[PDB]
Design a protein around this motif. Structure first.
Motif, PDB file in Angstrom:
ATOM      1  N   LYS A  16       0.825  -1.205   0.000  1.00  0.00           N
ATOM      2  CA  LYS A  16       0.000   0.000   0.000  1.00  0.00           C
ATOM      3  C   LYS A  16       0.861   1.258   0.000  1.00  0.00           C
ATOM      4  CE  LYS A  16      -1.768  -1.105   3.865  1.00  0.00           C
ATOM      5  NZ  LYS A  16      -0.837  -2.247   4.050  1.00  0.00           N
ATOM      6  N   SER A  17       1.840   1.317   0.904  1.00  0.00           N
ATOM      7  CA  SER A  17       2.720   2.477   0.973  1.00  0.00           C
ATOM      8  C   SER A  17       3.529   2.628  -0.306  1.00  0.00           C
ATOM      9  CB  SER A  17       3.648   2.354   2.179  1.00  0.00           C
ATOM     10  OG  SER A  17       2.927   2.012   3.349  1.00  0.00           O
ATOM     11  N   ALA A  18       4.030   1.515  -0.842  1.00  0.00           N
ATOM     12  CA  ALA A  18       4.794   1.570  -2.082  1.00  0.00           C
ATOM     13  C   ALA A  18       3.937   2.069  -3.236  1.00  0.00           C
ATOM     14  CB  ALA A  18       5.377   0.195  -2.401  1.00  0.00           C
ATOM     15  N   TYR A  32      10.082   0.471   3.240  1.00  0.00           N
ATOM     16  CA  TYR A  32       9.423   1.623   3.833  1.00  0.00           C
ATOM     17  C   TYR A  32       8.869   1.255   5.204  1.00  0.00           C
ATOM     18  CZ  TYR A  32       6.354   5.710   4.171  1.00  0.00           C
ATOM     19  OH  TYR A  32       5.723   6.862   4.574  1.00  0.00           O
ATOM     20  N   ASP A  33       8.756   2.253   6.069  1.00  0.00           N
ATOM     21  CA  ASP A  33       8.360   1.993   7.448  1.00  0.00           C
ATOM     22  C   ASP A  33       6.951   1.411   7.489  1.00  0.00           C
ATOM     23  OD1 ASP A  33       8.946   2.464  10.449  1.00  0.00           O
ATOM     24  OD2 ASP A  33       6.988   3.402  10.160  1.00  0.00           O
ATOM     25  N   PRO A  34       6.749   0.265   8.141  1.00  0.00           N
ATOM     26  CA  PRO A  34       5.436  -0.387   8.125  1.00  0.00           C
ATOM     27  C   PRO A  34       4.431   0.176   9.116  1.00  0.00           C
ATOM     28  CG  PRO A  34       6.982  -1.723   9.339  1.00  0.00           C
ATOM     29  CD  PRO A  34       7.773  -0.567   8.797  1.00  0.00           C
ATOM     30  N   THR A  35       4.800   1.174   9.918  1.00  0.00           N
ATOM     31  CA  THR A  35       3.904   1.709  10.932  1.00  0.00           C
ATOM     32  C   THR A  35       3.485   3.151  10.701  1.00  0.00           C
ATOM     33  OG1 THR A  35       5.829   2.236  12.305  1.00  0.00           O
ATOM     34  CG2 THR A  35       4.700   0.153  12.732  1.00  0.00           C
ATOM     35  N   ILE A  36       4.156   3.883   9.819  1.00  0.00           N
ATOM     36  CA  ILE A  36       3.804   5.275   9.569  1.00  0.00           C
ATOM     37  C   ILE A  36       2.593   5.323   8.647  1.00  0.00           C
ATOM     38  CG2 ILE A  36       5.564   5.343   7.770  1.00  0.00           C
ATOM     39  CD1 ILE A  36       5.754   8.299   8.115  1.00  0.00           C
ATOM     40  N   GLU A  37       1.559   6.043   9.075  1.00  0.00           N
ATOM     41  CA  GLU A  37       0.288   6.129   8.359  1.00  0.00           C
ATOM     42  C   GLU A  37       0.033   7.599   8.050  1.00  0.00           C
ATOM     43  OE1 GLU A  37      -2.999   5.133  10.760  1.00  0.00           O
ATOM     44  OE2 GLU A  37      -4.483   5.253   9.149  1.00  0.00           O
ATOM     45  N   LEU A  56      -5.401   8.068   1.884  1.00  0.00           N
ATOM     46  CA  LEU A  56      -4.937   7.597   3.181  1.00  0.00           C
ATOM     47  C   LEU A  56      -4.180   6.294   2.974  1.00  0.00           C
ATOM     48  CD1 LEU A  56      -4.782   7.721   6.257  1.00  0.00           C
ATOM     49  CD2 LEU A  56      -6.866   6.345   6.306  1.00  0.00           C
ATOM     50  N   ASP A  57      -2.858   6.362   3.083  1.00  0.00           N
ATOM     51  CA  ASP A  57      -1.987   5.191   3.043  1.00  0.00           C
ATOM     52  C   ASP A  57      -2.055   4.534   4.415  1.00  0.00           C
ATOM     53  OD1 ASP A  57       0.044   3.312   2.836  1.00  0.00           O
ATOM     54  OD2 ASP A  57       1.632   4.817   3.020  1.00  0.00           O
ATOM     55  N   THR A  58      -2.992   3.603   4.566  1.00  0.00           N
ATOM     56  CA  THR A  58      -3.279   3.033   5.874  1.00  0.00           C
ATOM     57  C   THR A  58      -2.087   2.244   6.401  1.00  0.00           C
ATOM     58  OG1 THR A  58      -5.573   2.842   5.146  1.00  0.00           O
ATOM     59  CG2 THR A  58      -4.973   1.738   7.186  1.00  0.00           C
ATOM     60  N   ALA A  59      -1.849   2.362   7.705  1.00  0.00           N
ATOM     61  CA  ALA A  59      -0.800   1.618   8.388  1.00  0.00           C
ATOM     62  C   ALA A  59      -1.111   1.629   9.877  1.00  0.00           C
ATOM     63  CB  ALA A  59       0.585   2.205   8.111  1.00  0.00           C
ATOM     64  N   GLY A  60      -0.385   0.800  10.619  1.00  0.00           N
ATOM     65  CA  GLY A  60      -0.601   0.714  12.056  1.00  0.00           C
ATOM     66  C   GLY A  60      -2.007   0.295  12.423  1.00  0.00           C
TER      67      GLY A  60
END
Ligand SMILES: Nc1nc2c(ncn2[C@@H]2O[C@H](COP(=O)(O)OP(=O)(O)O)[C@@H](O)[C@H]2O)c(=O)[nH]1
Ligand SMILES: [Mg+2]
Lengths: 165, 158
Positions: A16-18, A32-37, A56-60
């Motif tokens: 998702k972040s990528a 990429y950091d897996p917790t930064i949303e 919204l690049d969902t994370a955490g």
């Protein structure tokens, strides 16, 4: 310009972040950091019309986020990304869809199934299964690869078009 | 050798290993090392809420105004996560209270959008532009209006 709100949901590690960083900055980031949303804003031209996408690049997802709750409550569109080389993401897509339908309280929400990492030789999730599920839910299915950028723009623009219609 | 030690320091700062961070710093690790996106060990320490690692990095000489590929400083991340002690410590060391990312978002914008009132008021007390417009013409008051946060709007107004 009209502002479309999109939420990139899925499992951790699917991409998702990528995908979101590939769309907004036209380059691929690994590890990429897996917790930064973080929510990003991108100005796009689709069918000749200029729009602003707030993604919204969902994370955490383990923790609670008020911004995530606000986005999911008023989410105009969803990218239910899954990694084809990961069966667990394909399984959790159903749970994420159920949660989204419950919180939205609507039987019709604009969702797009995305199969990430098409460049990888492994294909643990068959394209036929994803196509059948997308047809059953009546939503488009695009296979993307943030590492090679094969279909990121097409997937996001398809989601925007689903928002329009 | 440089890159591997840098990556080990970054992963220790992210994971929250005071002993490992101390050992790597005493081993020659670079405090200004950045990953693919640009997250320095101070970025990750501020993001993940490790006060002790933040203190160690700031004492060792870690850059406090470094920005990743999206222009977010450690103060940006500490504000978006809601770490009151970390933002207070960063502002104590003269971190840019009006830093701008690729969208021109002040850490106040992130603190207000995430909903952390205490971060918002601490940033305002330390000289943050209340009427600050990002690259898309939105302010903290606009964020409060859009999100319907009555307490945030009250704090911004007063
Ligand atoms: N080959 C390939 N690798 C990817 C893709 N998307 C993500 N990755 C890899 O997956 C790793 C972490 O994925 P990430 O985007 O952080 O997952 P997420 O944060 O849960 O969306 C990164 O190191 C990337 O190299 C893709 O489309 N293709
Ligand atoms: Mg992520």
């Amino acid at each position: 310009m009209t502002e479309y709100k999109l939420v990139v949901v899925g499992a951790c590690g699917v991409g998702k972040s990528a995908l979101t960083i590939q769309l907004i900055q036209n380059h691929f980031v690994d590890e990429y950091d897996p917790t930064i949303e973080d929510s990003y804003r991108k100005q796009v031209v689709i069918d000749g019309e200029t729009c602003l996408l707030d993604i919204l690049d969902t994370a955490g997802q383990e923790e609670y986020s008020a911004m995530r709750d606000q986005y999911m409550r008023t989410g105009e569109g969803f990218l239910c990304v899954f990694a084809i080389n990961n069966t667990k993401s394909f399984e959790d897509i159903h749970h994420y869809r159920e949660q989204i339908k419950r919180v939205k309280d609507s039987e019709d929400v604009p969702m797009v199934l995305v199969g990430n990492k098409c460049d990888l030789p492994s294909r643990t999730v068959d394209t036929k299964q994803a196509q059948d599920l997308a047809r059953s839910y009546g939503i488009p299915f695009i296979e993307t690869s943030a590492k090679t950028r094969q279909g990121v723009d097409d997937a996001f623009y398809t989601l925007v078009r689903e928002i329009r219609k | 050798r440089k890159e591997e030690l840098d990556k080990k320091l970054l992963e220790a700062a992210r994971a929250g290993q005071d002993d490992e961070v101390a050992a790597l710093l005493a081993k020659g690790a670079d405090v200004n090392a950045h990953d693919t996106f640009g997250f320095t060990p101070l970025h990750l320490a501020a993001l993940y809420g490790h006060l002790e690692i933040v203190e160690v990095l700031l004492k060792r000489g870690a850059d406090i105004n470094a920005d990743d590929s999206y222009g977010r400083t450690p103060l940006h991340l500490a504000a978006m996560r809601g770490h009151l002690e970390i933002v207070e410590l960063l502002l104590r060391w003269g971190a840019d209270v009006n830093a701008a990312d690729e969208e021109g978002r002040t850490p106040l914008h992130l603190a207000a959008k995430r909903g952390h009132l205490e971060i918002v008021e601490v940033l305002l007390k330390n000289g943050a532009d209340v009427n600050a417009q990002d690259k898309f013409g939105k302010t903290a008051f606009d964020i409060s209006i859009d999100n319907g946060n009555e307490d945030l709007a009250e704090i911004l107004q007063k």
